[PDB]
Amino acid sequence: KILLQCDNLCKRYQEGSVQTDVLHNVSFSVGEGEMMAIVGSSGSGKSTLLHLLGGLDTPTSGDVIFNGQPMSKLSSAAKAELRNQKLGFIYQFHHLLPDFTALENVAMPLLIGKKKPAEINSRALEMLKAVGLDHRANHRPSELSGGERQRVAIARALVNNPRLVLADQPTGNLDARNADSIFQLLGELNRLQGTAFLVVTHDLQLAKRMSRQLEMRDGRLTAELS
Amino acid sequence: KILLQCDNLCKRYQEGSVQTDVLHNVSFSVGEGEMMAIVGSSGSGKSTLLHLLGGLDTPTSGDVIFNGQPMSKLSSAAKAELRNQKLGFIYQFHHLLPDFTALENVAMPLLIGKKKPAEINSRALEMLKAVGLDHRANHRPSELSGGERQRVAIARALVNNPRLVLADQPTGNLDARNADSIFQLLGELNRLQGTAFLVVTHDLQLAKRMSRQLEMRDGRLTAELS
Amino acid sequence: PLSLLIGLRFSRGRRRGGMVSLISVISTIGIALGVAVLIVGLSAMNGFERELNNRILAVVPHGEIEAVDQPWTNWQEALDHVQKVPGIAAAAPYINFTGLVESGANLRAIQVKGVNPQQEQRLSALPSFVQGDAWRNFKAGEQQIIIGKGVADALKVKQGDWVSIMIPNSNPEHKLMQPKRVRLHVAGILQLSGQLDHSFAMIPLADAQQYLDMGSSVSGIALKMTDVFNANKLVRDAGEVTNSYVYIKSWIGTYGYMYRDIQMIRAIMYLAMVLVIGVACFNIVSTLVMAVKDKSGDIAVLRTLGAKDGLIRAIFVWYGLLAGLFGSLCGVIIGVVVSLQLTPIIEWIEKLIGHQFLSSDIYFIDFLPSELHWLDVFYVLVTALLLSLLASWYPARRASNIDPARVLSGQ
Amino acid sequence: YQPVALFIGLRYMRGRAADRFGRFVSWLSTIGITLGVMALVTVLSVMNGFERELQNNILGLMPQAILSSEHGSLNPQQLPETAVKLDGVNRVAPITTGDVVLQSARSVAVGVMLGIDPAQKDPLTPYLVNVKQTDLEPGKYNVILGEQLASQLGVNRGDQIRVMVPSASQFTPMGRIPSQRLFNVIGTFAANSEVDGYEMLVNIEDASRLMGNITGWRLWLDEPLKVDSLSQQKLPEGSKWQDWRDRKGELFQAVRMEKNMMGLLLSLIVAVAAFNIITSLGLMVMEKQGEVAILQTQGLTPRQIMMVFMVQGASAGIIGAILGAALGALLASQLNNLMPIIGVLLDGAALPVAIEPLQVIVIALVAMAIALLSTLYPSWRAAATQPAEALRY
Ligand SMILES: Nc1ncnc2c1ncn2[C@@H]1O[C@H](COP(=O)(O)OP(=O)(O)OP(=O)(O)O)[C@@H](O)[C@H]1O
Ligand SMILES: Nc1ncnc2c1ncn2[C@@H]1O[C@H](COP(=O)(O)OP(=O)(O)OP(=O)(O)O)[C@@H](O)[C@H]1O
Ligand SMILES: [Mg+2]
Ligand SMILES: [Mg+2]
């Protein structure tokens, strides 16, 4: 079965008289519990595609179907719920709230989901230990390093046990060992919770661990090349 | 040879009467034209050390001497001159002025240096083309991508032909091809003008192209372990 | 220049911004509003201050010197002995008494003041431009004389009607006797106001000498000065040369309660003006502080590239001038228009609202008088420009003195 | 905790700070609200204090209003004391007023007659000195004068005063003799007011008038400045209705002008203060447009974002209003003892009341409502932008 489908997805940018288009009828489908890599060149259009599939932007030339529900014909009272439980998102620059601690940052989607308290701390600490951040659970994002500021976002995406995780470069600020550990964690999560992963990566080595690879040369999702 | 020398400097943090020590007696030295790599695990303290060497933070112990002049005891005008004419810096998160264009961002160090406007635009355009960003000179940082923003920061660092470049993960958000091209450009710059490149990198195979490969762990600069 | 370029880019920074950003328009209409309310308040204060001088101080005379109830003709040097103290604009000998006016069984008590033939209008502005009546042509003969319009309540008279006059003896002895009740011809009516022009009449000093018995002695003196609220000092000072008995009361002494009320009113108005100045200057400094606090990150980035503190100072004084000059100019443009030609009568009902806020409460007209000074406007512009420069300067240097790595990280 | 909106709103206040100046930028809105509220309450207190002080000290001795009846020496037989039905009436007592010329052994002056029953208590009673309001027998023609007047014309205890009534004059074809009487002063009287200059009192029953005298009716006013609305009244032929504005007319004009100017200055203060609250909170909402993008990414309903920003606005406004009310009350109560306005005018003082229930309460509530309403639109505008669009900056 399929989980997230997009077809004829075109996005163009126009602020002044100058036009700049980034996508050319991108069409692909992701099934449940599926590894996937969207490795590609810089400036190709990987991040904007991820924004479009997540419902955080308007494609204006197509539609994205999530679990049979198109994203355009969705009320704000329903988009929020989908975005809170069914889908998790990791930004490329790991946008964190710079007034909460790391523990509160990881536990924020659990608070938003109206979960009953006194185990929110347990799940947040479990995820912070899983990404390897037990000793930095009281530091604000301003007091965190760039490498471990990314792990907070990674844990925040995975703390709610979603169905599909859209990761935008979850590796670029990490070393090889931490990247390997986090990819093992993602594989373990797929094995147990069955969560599909759509990861945009620049590291070609760990991209081979992904079940499927795409290219996105110049805004078109080609099958495979280099 | 020598150009920059660290005299047993160490850094601690007081996060509200709580001590979290981050550095332990760093006493390494670098010559002129020596391309250096620092490698370490995430959260070890590479970026704090790089900030300390550039004069952007207080060492709270020891001192950093630039070819005979300590950075602790220096006039504000002299510090600004040093930072503008003979020291380039690449931030890990490429802080660029958001209201200016890419060309204006790259040309900004030349404008502060009081150069002739005829050559400023030519030099900025040449440096923008060097990182392969010719087709985005009119784009604001909000209209650029992660890789393009990183390349703009790299071009801004090298646009003034400094004697020493402090790079903090210059190829974090780049693919393999662009990272290889950037490192090649760094090599050509080192061979032509003789500028030392103190680069912090998370990539191991790309760090093998350096003269010395110091590994920094737990606030200490080990000779070589991994 | 580079600093002006950076300041203008900061002004138009938000997105494309069209012409200017949200921070720019919010920071430039606060200055305009402050300047407008400042000049409006100062114009209203000047308009009220003119009213007190015209309607209260000019109406009543200041100071006196009384006689020893004996024939005292040696007073011709008084007009030469009032210029010893500077500030005495004019002086005029005068006489006062009381009487009755009869016209159709409408007797009314009237105090009557005798004035100098030539100094009746230079001494004070009261009997000068009331109605342009048949004054300044009385002579010693032609005893027809002027009275206020408000005295003709039960009396129906005009410029030529005849009335009766009752006078007392006022002999120079220990006590008083029966009144003489010597009648006289009086004709002529003026109009000044409704408060003083109720039971007040006017007589010459020339015709007061005959049918009287003090031997052409002018008992009282009159004075006018500039320091009206300080006038107690100069009245005593000018009375150094006098007869054996001298009284040094003035408008302050005779009307102490009215003077106290006037001083209280002035103090309250000055307190309210100080409050307006304090409030209308806070929204200027506060809004410009937030802009620089927002731009602190770009200040750090500029300091990283090697920008000297002089460059940042120039950038932010240009930023303050751009946010201040346009705002102050718009402020004076709107304020001078709304103060010189105030919105006369369009105040009845405001725009339709879902819930009316405190309807049928106390409603007051804003201001009838307003004086254009064209000098306090310059002071308001100077203080607005100075405050705009000062507000966008201290946070600039405060952010410039921090290490770039700390502030750029978000600390 | 469970109310996530309240938690985020409380955490948005009490920011990172870590500096003396860092707290100032976060507390700018609270400081502005406090300044506006304090200025409003202290200026209202000063205004009300002046109005009350002038009202008491001037119109607590002179008749605020009186009717007229001169036909037949009218008694309440035509209409009892309950004849007046106008609003703002609190008490009515008999009175008799008119201009009278007083001749002494050495001087002649003028005054106004006051008719006060010995049994009836008048507002001028407590200021009597050395006398106990006695000797005002109907049979005796005893005269009460004023201290200022008595010093002015030189009359003390044990003297005689000739009384002439110009209004009550019998016109005949011999002379022009008005009503003439001889009164004896058998007491010392005083009052600390302007009215002491010409106050003088007698019994109502006297033959001072032609006919055996006119009988007015003193009418106390709950609002002595309401007199502009004295149009609704009834009176018989040959008489009229009178107000306190017949005397001190320039005082009434000055009071009206001062009230108008104070109202204008109040409007200016409100206009400046309301603008500062509206813009500062809107800019605080607009500045954190990236935070709401992250919250919407995590799954926050726009209603929840509106609640977050409304909670922050309320938390700022309540503290600002309370601090402003406290500071304004303290400044009003200490405008003279502390002497903050050192450059005080000569013989000039400011009198406050700082009345609580109707002045310092509604202002704070209006300020809090303005703080609430200023936040709603910017939060709605920020919640409409796409999360990936706002986060690009
Ligand atoms: N106020 C603070 N400023 C900076 N680092 C702090 C502070 N308080 C605690 N720390 C911790 O000190 C360490 C310093 O690490 P640093 O910021 O230099 O990054 P790093 O080791 O180069 O990491 P990476 O390259 O993976 O981002 C981190 O673990 C950080 O969480
Ligand atoms: N608002 C915009 N106006 C114009 N061009 C834009 C706009 N937003 C994005 N672009 C361009 O469209 C392309 C899409 O960039 P995108 O962020 O998808 O790249 P990327 O592959 O993720 O980058 P990186 O390698 O830096 O991570 C880029 O070339 C970018 O410059
Ligand atoms: Mg991207
Ligand atoms: Mg780092």
Numbering used by the authors:
A (entry chain D), B (entry chain F): 3 to 228
C (entry chain E): 4 to 414
D (entry chain C): 2 to 212, 217 to 398
Authors' text:
Depending on their roles, mature lipoproteins are either retained in the periplasmic leaflet of the IM or transported to the OM by the localization of lipoprotein (Lol) pathway, which consists of five proteins LolA-E25. In this study, we determined the cryogenic electron microscopic (cryo-EM) structures of endogenously captured lipoprotein- or ATP-bound LolCDE reconstituted in nanodiscs.
To investigate the molecular basis of ATP-bound LolCDE, we determined the structure of the mutant complex LolCDE171QE. The structure of E. coli LolCDE171QE reconstituted in nanodiscs was determined to 3.2 Å using cryo-EM. Despite the absence of added nucleotides, additional cryo-EM densities were observed in the catalytic pockets of LolD, which were identified as ATP molecules and magnesium ions. The nucleotide-binding domains (NBDs) of LolCDE171QE adopt a closed conformation, tightly sandwiching the endogenously captured ATP molecules between the RecA-like subdomain and the α-helical subdomain of opposing LolD subunits. In the ATP-bound LolCDE171QE structure, a pair of polar residues, Q301 and T302, from the coupling helix of LolC interact with R85 on the side helix (S78-Q87) and Y93 on the Q-loop (I92-A104) of one LolD subunit, while R306 and T307 from the coupling helix of LolE interact with S78 on the side helix and Y93 on the Q-loop of the other LolD, respectively. In the ATP-bound structure, TM1 and TM2 of both LolC and LolE are more parallel, creating a closed interface as opposed to the V-shaped cavity observed in the lipoprotein-bound structure. In this structure, TM2 of LolE undergoes an inward and upward movement, resulting in an approximately 90-degree bend at the periplasmic neck, transitioning from a relatively straight conformation in the lipoprotein-bound structure to a bent conformation in the ATP-bound state. In the ATP-bound structure, the hook of LolC lifts and shifts towards the interface between the PDs, positioning itself to be accessible by both LolA and the bound lipoprotein.
